Amino acid sequence: GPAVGIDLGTTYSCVGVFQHGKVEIIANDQGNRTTPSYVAFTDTERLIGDAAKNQVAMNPTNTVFDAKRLIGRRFDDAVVQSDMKHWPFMVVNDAGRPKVQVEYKGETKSFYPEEVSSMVLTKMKEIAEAYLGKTVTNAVVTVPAYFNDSQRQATKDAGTIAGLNVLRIINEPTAAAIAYGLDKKVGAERNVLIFDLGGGTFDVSILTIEDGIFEVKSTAGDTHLGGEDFDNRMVNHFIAEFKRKHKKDISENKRAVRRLRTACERAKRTLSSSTQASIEIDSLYEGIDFYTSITRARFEELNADLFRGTLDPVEKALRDAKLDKSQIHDIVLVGGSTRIPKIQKLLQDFFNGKELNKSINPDEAVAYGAAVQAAILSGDK
Numbered sequence: 001g002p003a004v005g006i007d008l009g010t011t012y013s014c015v016g017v018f019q020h021g022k023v024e025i026i027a028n029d030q031g032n033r034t035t036p037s038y039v040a041f042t043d044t045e046r047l048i049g050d051a052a053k054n055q056v057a058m059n060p061t062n063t064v065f066d067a068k069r070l071i072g073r074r075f076d077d078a079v080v081q082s083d084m085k086h087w088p089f090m091v092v093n094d095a096g097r098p099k100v101q102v103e104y105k106g107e108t109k110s111f112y113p114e115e116v117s118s119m120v121l122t123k124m125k126e127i128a129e130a131y132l133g134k135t136v137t138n139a140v141v142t143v144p145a146y147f148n149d150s151q152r153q154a155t156k157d158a159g160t161i162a163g164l165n166v167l168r169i170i171n172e173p174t175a176a177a178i179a180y181g182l183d184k185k186v187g188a189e190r191n192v193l194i195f196d197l198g199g200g201t202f203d204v205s206i207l208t209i210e211d212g213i214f215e216v217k218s219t220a221g222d223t224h225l226g227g228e229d230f231d232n233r234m235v236n237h238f239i240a241e242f243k244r245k246h247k248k249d250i251s252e253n254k255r256a257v258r259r260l261r262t263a264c265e266r267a268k269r270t271l272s273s274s275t276q277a278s279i280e281i282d283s284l285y286e287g288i289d290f291y292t293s294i295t296r297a298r299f300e301e302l303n304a305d306l307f308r309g310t311l312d313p314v315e316k317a318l319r320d321a322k323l324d325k326s327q328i329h330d331i332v333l334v335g336g337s338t339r340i341p342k343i344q345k346l347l348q349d350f351f352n353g354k355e356l357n358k359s360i361n362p363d364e365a366v367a368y369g370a371a372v373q374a375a376i377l378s379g380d381k
């Protein structure tokens with residue numbers, strides 16, 4: 001059948017298929033080309049993707065996300081212990097392994113991270129089957145370059161649990177480079193910087209590609225910096241505004257804050273292609289409408305430190321790879337946040353004007369390369 005590429009992302013996942021000489025990135029039921037890596041459990045059902053994210057404020061302790069932060073890890077991992085303080089859902093210890101614990105159909109139930117990720121993968125599989133009209137079994141699934149064997153194995157296991165035949169687990173920066181055919185240029189080695197700014201994580205990778213070998217020279221970044229932080233800055237901005245205008249602090253009203261957050265995320269996306277964005281929320285709080293706007297300049301100002309700060313891991317990656325800026329053949333934009341004009345300007349300026357590879361939607365580039373690899377491994381390329 002058709003082999004697919006799946007980017008199983010920390011915040012958003014994406015599925016592509018290579019057929020008839022090109023990659024098609026597949027839209028979900030709602031027409032979205034990426035799907036939130038969310039699973040929710042209710043009195044009646046299990047929800048995955050858009051439907052799960054959509055009900056988070058009304059069911060926060062039974063709505064699971066960030067499974068990628070747990071997958072392949074032990075409960076007593078410092079990372080797991082630290083991350084747990086920022087999740088509304090329970091994480092419990094089963095004989096050393098972390099499990100998310102939720103209420104579901106009126107009973108208490110627990111799931112391993114790879115079970116939760118299996119559900120997201122099931123959804124991605126179903127998305128592909130809905131479009132293709134065919135059973136989808138074979139897949140290439142991607143992971144961050146720094147993932148160890150426990151994390152890779154658990155990611156593969158998530159696929160197996162979802163009934164996927166995982167052809168290979170490949171690195172996200174490798175998938176991005178494959179998408180751009182940077183392994184197929186007429187020449188010897190190519191030094192490639194992958195600048196991946198996603199929803200919750202920032203990954204910089206330097207690869208040296210030669211003879212079909214994607215040597216990881218260095219990785220850097222911030223596992224807790226992404227688009228969510230920019231949204232947070234916007235949310236705080238508007239909470240303060242509403243307090244001034246109406247003498248109401250909406251902060252502890254989970255539904256109101258969530259609706260504001262959704263509006264902010266949308267506005268952010270709009271600001272990547274327009275110089276201003278409208279915020280339009282009926283009855284944000286006590287029936288009070290919240291209709292206003294934000295300029296691209298104000299968004300950039302709110303986030304100025306965070307945007308500039310992405311360059312520090314780039315310098316670090318270069319130093320650790322023992323390469324000058326000028327030795328980089330290709331710069332590749334990955335992750336939805338790299339659509340931000342200010343981020344692109346900062347990075348291009350940092351490379352003293354060098355053109356960026358960004359023709360492939362950055363939030364789709366990983367899935368794109370995974371789809372190409374899947375075709376190669378299934379003999380369809």
Ligand SMILES: Nc1ncnc2c1ncn2[C@@H]1O[C@H](COP(=O)(O)OP(=O)(O)O)[C@@H](O)[C@H]1O
Nearest residue numbers: 009010011012198199227272335336337339363
């Ligand atoms: N046009 C855009 N402009 C700015 N941010 C965007 C845009 N499109 C998506 N994003 C942001 O990208 C982030 C998701 O990145 P993505 O790479 O899809 O996920 P992940 O990091 O989970 O792989 C979210 O914070 C989302 O708001």
Ligand SMILES: [Mg+2]
Nearest residue numbers: 009198335366
């Ligand atoms: Mg990603």
Ligand code: NA
Nearest residue numbers: 007009012013
């Ligand atoms: Na993604």
Ligand code: NA
Nearest residue numbers: 196198201203
């Ligand atoms: Na990332």
